[PDB]
C-alpha cells in the first residue's frame, strides 16, 4: 500500500492508502528543554516531538519547523518525519511509497530537499509531490471547482475546470490559522490576559479552536456585542483560572476577511477568491461560482460559509447562483483526496521512483510533478 | 440511401438523403487543451470536436480547419469528418454515397484532396461535389435565378438560367460571417468590452446572431442611434455581465455592404450582385432581376431583404421588377437542396465511383464536375 | 508654446513643445497611507503622488489609475494631472495647448472623459489626442514603418506606409511591462523571495529594469543556465539583503514571446508583428519588413532586437531584408516625436479648440482625431 | 515640331515628332488613397498618376480612365494628359501640334470630347486623331497590309491596300490585354493565390508580361503540362513570396484564340483576321495574305506569329502565301509610325486647326478625319 | 496650561507643559506601617507616599501599585495622583488639562478607569492618554525611528515612520528594571548578602543604579572577572556595612539580552528590536536601522549602546549603517515629548473633553486616542 503524509503548517496528518480516517493527526512541534534537568534517575531526552511534546509543554520551548508552508529548519523536520514513520506508523518507509502535499507557489529548494530526504535518509521506494487544493478537490468527489484552502500557514485559491488547473489564476496569501492565533494573542491583552511563550500560544490556539465563530456582518455584530453580555463566553485555563471573552470571539477569524487588521495589504479571502476566478476565462466562471470548495481547519468556524457566500454575492453579479461546498469533514479533506489518489490505478505510473531518481538527479521532481 | 453533408465554413450540417432537415448541425471547430491537466482520469482527450468542444470552450483553444472555404488544416478537418460520420450520424460511409458542397472558384487541390480523403481514408463507394448555391437554388424549386450565398467564410453570386450555370459571371468575395464576427470583436472595444481569444469569439458570434440586423437606411440609422437610446439593447454573458450595445448592432452587418470598413477594396454585396447580373447577356437579365435567391446564415439578419432590395432597385433600371426569394429556412437551403438533388434518379449516373477513381486518379473530379 | 504629456501606463512624461527631452518623467502612482498616523504634524497628506509617493512607498498603498491603457480611476488621474501641471512643470494649463497620447483601439469613453476633464477642469486652450505609435514614428524621422510600441500596459503594432495608417492591420495586446513584473513576482517565489505588496512590486520592477535581458535563443540558454552559474547575478534590496537570480533574468521578458507563460492565448510580439504586416496589402510588406520601429520602455532589454529580428527572419521569406530600428533613446520616443507634432506648423489647425467644443459637445474628439 | 501622344488603353506613349522612340512611356492609371492619412508632415496629394501612382499602388485604389478604348472617367483623363504634357514631356501645349490615336468603331462622342478639351482646356494649336492601325502600318514602311492591332483594351483588324482602307471589312473586338489579365486572375485561384485588389491586378499583369506565351498546339501543350513539370516557372512577388505556374502560362493568352474561355461569342483573333480578309474583294486577298502585320503589346507574346501562321494557313487557301510581319519593336509601332506621318509634308494640310474649329464646332473632326 | 504626568512603573514624573526639567519626580510607592505605634503624637499618619515614604522605609512596607505597566490597586494609586497633584505640584486638578501615558498593548480597564478617576474624582477639564514610545521619539526631535523604551516594568519596541505607526510591529516584554533588581537580589545571595523585605529592594535598586554596566561581550568579561581583581567595586550600605561586588556588576543587566536568566522564554531586547523591525515593510527597514532610539532609565547603563549596536550589526546585514540615538537625558525622554505635545498647537484639538465624556462614558477615550 501507499502512505499519505500531509505535512501541514500546524498539524501533520498521516495515513495508509485507502482509509477514510487518518491514522495520525498531531501538531507539528519540536520541543527542547528550556531549563536544567535535576533528576538523574528519571533523566530527560534532548528533544520531544508530537503529542508527547504537547503534553509536557510547560518546561519545553516549542518550534514549528514549517512556517507559512516553507520548511525553515530541516533537522527538526526530519525528526518529525522520523516520528511519523517509526513511532506512530511503526512502519518501514523502504517498502512503502510516500505521497506528500504542499502549498502552491513554493520555493523549489523546499521540494528539492523533501525529495532528497525521502530518497536518501528514508530511502522510500517512490515519492510524489502534489498540490493540496487538487487533493481537496478529489476529496469532494468532483472534477470542476475552485478550492479555497487555508491551513495553519498558507491560504490559497486554486481553480480547476474539467481537471485542467489554471496556474495564472492561482492565488497565494501567507495569512492563516497560525497568524490568527498570533492576532488572538495580541488582542487578548485587551482584557488583561498575557500569553508570551509558545506554551501559552497553544492555549490561545485552543481558545480559537473551541470558541471562535464567523459573524454574518461586522458592524452590527460589534453593536450587539457592545450593547449586551449575551456574546461573552467563559473558558477554563489549564490552571483553573476562568477567562470571559466577548467580541474577540469573532474578531479573530474576521482577520481572514480584513487582513488590514494584522497590517497585511492584500484583500480578504472572499476578495482573493473573487480575483482568482476573475482571472479565469469567461465560459467557466459560472461553473466556478457554484463550486466554492473549502478545505483546511481555518474554515471550520461556525457560519464562515454564510458570511463568505454573502460577500461573494455582494461582489458577484445578481443573476448568478453561488453554492459553497463546506463538507463537515473538510479539515481532513486535503488528506482524504490523497487516500483516493494513492488508490487510483491510473496514477500508479506517476510515482517518482529511485531508478529515475539516481539517473535524473534531484531536479527530477520538477519535470514529473506540477 | 445517400449522405448529404454540407461542410460549411462555420457549421457542419449533415443528414441522410431525402429528409426535409439535416440530422446533425454542429460547429466546425477543433479544440485543444491550452493549460496543464492536474486531474488524472479516463475522461480527458487529446482533442475535442463539435458541440462537445463548444460546451467546454473556456478551457480549449479553437481552430477552424476551414478558412474562407479553403480547407487549411487537413488533419483537423479529417477529425471533424470522423466525428460527423461515426458519432453524430452513427453511420459507416463505406456503404453510402456522400454528397459534399463547395464554394465556387476554389483551389483545385482543395477538392482533389477532399476526393482523396473520401476515397482512401473512408472508402466511400461514391461521392459527388456540388456548388453550394446551385444546391440552394434546387431547394427553392426553380430553374432560373441568381443565388447570392453567404456562409461563414465566403460569399458568392452565381446566376443560373434553365439549369445552365454561366462560368464567366460567378463573383466570389472572401468577406462573410467570420469577418463580421472579427469586426464585431474589433469594434466592441469601443464600449470597453474586451474579447481577445478564441473562446469569447464564439460569444461575440452569439451576440451577432441574436442582436444584429441590417438598417434600411444607414445614415438616418446613425442619426437615430446617436439621438436616442431606443436601439440600445442588453445581452447577458455566460458570467452575468450585461452589455449594452447601440449602433453596434447594425454596424456589423453593413460590412457586407461597405467592405471598406474592414479595409477591403471590393464593393458591397448589393453591387457585387448587380455586377454578377450585368456581366450576363442582356435578354436574360430580366429573369434574374426577379429571382434573387438568398441563402446562408449570413443572410438571416432581419431586414437584409428589404435593404438589399432598395440597393438593387437603386442600381436597377426603373421599369424593372425586383423581387427577392427569402425562405425562412434559407440557412438550411444548401443542405435541403442536396437532399432533393441526391434523390433525383437523373443523378444516379453522376456519382464519381471508386472504380473510375482508381483508374483516373484525383484528376477525375475535374472532368466529371463543374 | 505647447505641452506634450505622454500618459503611459507606468510613467508620465511631460515637457514643452520643441524640447529634445521630457522635462518631467515620473511614475504614475497615487499612494495612500495604510497605517494610522500618530505624530500630529503639518506634513501628512491624504495621498502622495509621483516621486514623493515613490519614496514613501514602505508606508503607502500604491495604485496605478491606468491599467492596460484604459483609465479605471478618474479622480486619482485628475490628481496625477494636478501634479504634472502644477508641481512638475509648474505651468498654468489655461494658456498652453496640451497634446495627449492614447493606445489604439481604446474604449471611446476613455478619450471622451480625458477630453471632458481637459476642457472643464483645466480649461486648456486646445488639445489633440494622437496615437502613440504615430508619434514614436515621428521621432524616428521617417514616413513609412511598422511601429511596435510596448509600454507598461499595452503592446500594439501599427503599420503605416508613406504616412497612411492601416486601421484594419492594427494589432493590440494587453500584455506589457506590468504583466512581466507580475510574472517576475510569481516566479521569484521559486527562489524563496516573496513579494506581495504594492511597494514591493516597485522593487521587482526595478529588478526587472536592471538585471533582465532577452536571450537570443531560449532552449540552449536554459541548458546553459542549468549547466553553470555564469548567468546568475546579484542585487541588493533596499533593506540590504542580497538576492541571486539565474534564469529568471531572461524568463521574465520571454513572456513577450510566449504569452502562454502568463496564460494569455494571443501570440508573441514577433508573431503579432508578422500578422500585422501580413494583414497589409502585398506591395508594401517589403518596405515594412525593413522598417521595424521599436518604442516604449518594454523594449530596452539587451538583445531584444536581435532575437525578434531572428524570429521575423525565420517567419519572413528568405529574400526579404529584415531591418530593425532600435534608437538608444526609444524609451522617450513617443514623447520626443510628439514634440515634433506640436512644433510642426501645418498642425496648428489640428487642435480641438474650446470654441468648437462648446457647440459640438464632448463628441468632437471623434471626428477630428484618428 | 509636333507631338505624338498615343493614349493607349493601359500605357501612354508620348514624344516629339521625328524621334524614333517615345520619350514618355508610363501606365495610364489614376490612383487614390484608400486609407486615412496620419502623417501630417508628408506631401500627400489627392490623386497620384503615372509611374508615381505605380510606385505607391500598394496603398492606392487604381482606376483606368480608358476601358475598351473608351474614356469612361474624363476628369481622370484630363489629369493624365496634364501629367503627360507638363510633367513628362515638360512642354507648353499651346505652341505644339499634337497627334492622337484612336481605335476604329469607337463611339463618336469619344473623339468629339477629345477634340473639345484639346482645343478648350489645353488650347492646342491643331491636332489630329488617326486610326491606330493605320499608323502601325505607316511604321512598317508599307502601303499594303492587314494590320491586326491588339492593345490593352481593344483588338481590331483593318486591311489597307495602296493606302486605301476598306471600312466595311474593318473588324473590332473588345477582348484585349486587360481581359487577359482578368482571366489570369480568375485562373490563378486554382493554385490558391488570390488577387482581388487593383494593386494585385498590376502584379498579375506583370506575371502576364514575364511568364506567358502562346502555344503552337493547345492540346499537345496540355498533355505536356499535365505530364511533366518542365513547363512550370516560378515568379517572385514584391513581398518575397514565390508562385509556381504551369499550364496557366499558355491558357491566359489563348483566350485571344478561344474567347469562349471568358464567355464571349466572338471568334478568335485568327478567325477574326481571316474574316476581315474574306470580306474583302477577291483580287486583293493574296496581297493581304502575305502582309499580316501585328502591333500592340498584347502581340508581344512569344510564339504568336508562328501560331497565326499555323491557324491562318489552316483556314486560308493552300496556294496563297502567308507571312507574319512581327517587328521586334511593334509594341511602339502605333507611336513610331505616327512620328513618321506627323513629319511628312503632306500632313500639314490635314491638321484640324483652331480657326476652322471655332466655326465648325466639335463636328469638324468627323468630316476631316477617318 | 496643561500638565504632563507619566506614571512610570517605578518613577512618577509630573510637570507643566514647556518645561525642560521635571517639577516632580519620585518613586511610585505607597507605604504602610508594619509595627505597632507606641508614641502618641500628631506625626503618625495612616499611609505614606512618594519620597517621604522613601525616607521612612525602615518601619514601612512598600507597595508598587504599577506592576508591569498595568494598574492593580486603585486606592493607593489614587492616593498617588492626589499627592502628585497637591503636595508635589501644589496645583488644583479642575483648571489644568492632564496628559497621561501608557505602555502599548495595555488592558482596556486600565485606561478606562484612569480617565474615569481623572474626570470624576479630580474633575480634570480634559485628559488624554498617549503612547510612551511616541513621546520619547518626539523628545529626539524626529519623525521616523524605532523606539526601544524600557522603564521599571515594561520594555517595548514601537517603530514609526513619518508619523505613522505600525501596530502589527509593536513588541512588548514584561521585563524591565524591576525584574533586574529582583534578579540582583537573587544573585547577591552568593556573596552572602541577603535582602528580602521591600525596604532593601530600594537598597539593591540603588546598587544597580550606581554600579552595573553592560559588557561588550559577556564571555571574555566573565573570564576577566574570574581571572583578576580589576573590576570589583565597593558600596557603602546605609548601616555602615560595606560590600564588594565583581561579576554581578555586569550579570545584572545581561538579563535584558538573555531573559533565560530569569526563566523567561522571549529573546533579548536586541533580537526583540530586530524582529520588531523585520515585521515592518522592506522599503523602510534601512531608515529604522539608522534611527534606533533608546529611552527610559533601563537603557542608562554605561556601554549599553555599544553592545546593542554590536549585536544588531551581528544580526543585521553587513552594508547597513546602524546608529543608536542615546541622548544623555533619556531617563526623562518619555516625559519631555509630552511637554511638546501639550504645547503643540496642532494638538490643542485632540483632547478628550468632559462635555464629550458626559455623553460617551469611558468608551470615548478609545476612539480618539491610540
Ligand atoms: N474548529 C476550528 N476552528 C477554528 N480553527 C481551527 C479549528 N480546527 C482547526 N483549526 C485551525 O486550522 C489550522 C490548520 O489545520 P489543518 O486544517 O489540519 O491544516 P494544516 O494542518 O495542513 O495547516 C490549525 O492550526 C488550527 O488552528
Ligand atoms: N440568425 C442569424 N443571424 C445572423 N447570422 C447567423 C444567424 N445564424 C447563423 N448565422 C451565421 O451564419 C454563418 C454561416 O452558417 P451557414 O449559413 O450554415 O453557412 P456555413 O455553410 O458556412 O455553415 C455562421 O457562422 C453564423 O455565424
Ligand atoms: N531600461 C529598462 N529595461 C527594461 N525595462 C524597462 C526599462 N525602462 C523601463 N522599462 C519598463 O518599461 C515599462 C514602460 O516604460 P515606458 O516606455 O515609460 O511606458 P509608458 O509609456 O507606459 O510609461 C516600465 O513599466 C518599465 O517596467
Ligand atoms: N512583353 C509583353 N508580353 C506580354 N504582354 C505585354 C508585353 N508588353 C506589353 N504587354 C501588354 O500589352 C498591353 C497594351 O500595351 P500597348 O501595346 O502599348 O497598347 P496600349 O496602347 O493599349 O497601351 C499592356 O497592357 C500590357 O499588359
Ligand atoms: N543610571 C541608571 N542605571 C541603570 N538603571 C537605572 C538608572 N537610572 C534609573 N534606572 C532604572 O530605570 C528604571 C525606570 O525608571 P524610568 O526611566 O523613570 O521609567 P519609569 O519610571 O517610567 O518606569 C528604574 O526602576 C531604575 O531602576
Numbering used by the authors:
A (entry chain C), B (entry chain D), C (entry chain A), D (entry chain E), E (entry chain B): 8 to 377
Quote the paper.
Actin, tropomyosin and troponin, the proteins that comprise the contractile apparatus of the cardiac thin filament, are highly conserved across species. The main components of the thin filament are actin, tropomyosin, and troponin. The thin filament plays a crucial role in the “cross-bridge cycle” and force production in striated muscle. We have used cryo-EM to study the three-dimensional structure of the zebrafish cardiac thin and actin filaments.
The zebrafish thin filaments in this study were isolated directly from the adult cardiac muscle, thus the native filaments were subject to any naturally occurring post translational modifications. However, the percentage of decorated filaments actin was ~ 10% : the dissociation of the thin filaments upon isolation is a known issue. Our data contained large numbers of undecorated actin filaments providing the opportunity to determine the structure of zebrafish cardiac actin. Without the imposition of helical symmetry, we calculated an actin structure of equal length to our thin filament map to a resolution of 3.89Å, (EMDB 17120). A reconstruction of zebrafish cardiac F-actin demonstrates no deviations from human cardiac actin over an extended length of 14 actin subunits. Zebrafish actin has, as expected an extremely high sequence identity (98%) to human. A TM score of 0.97 and a RMSD of 1.19 confirms the expected structural similarity of the two proteins. The thin filament is a macromolecular complex with a stable actin filament core and more mobile regulatory proteins, and as would be expected the resolution of the actin density was higher than the more flexible domains of troponin in the Yamada cryo-EM reconstructions.
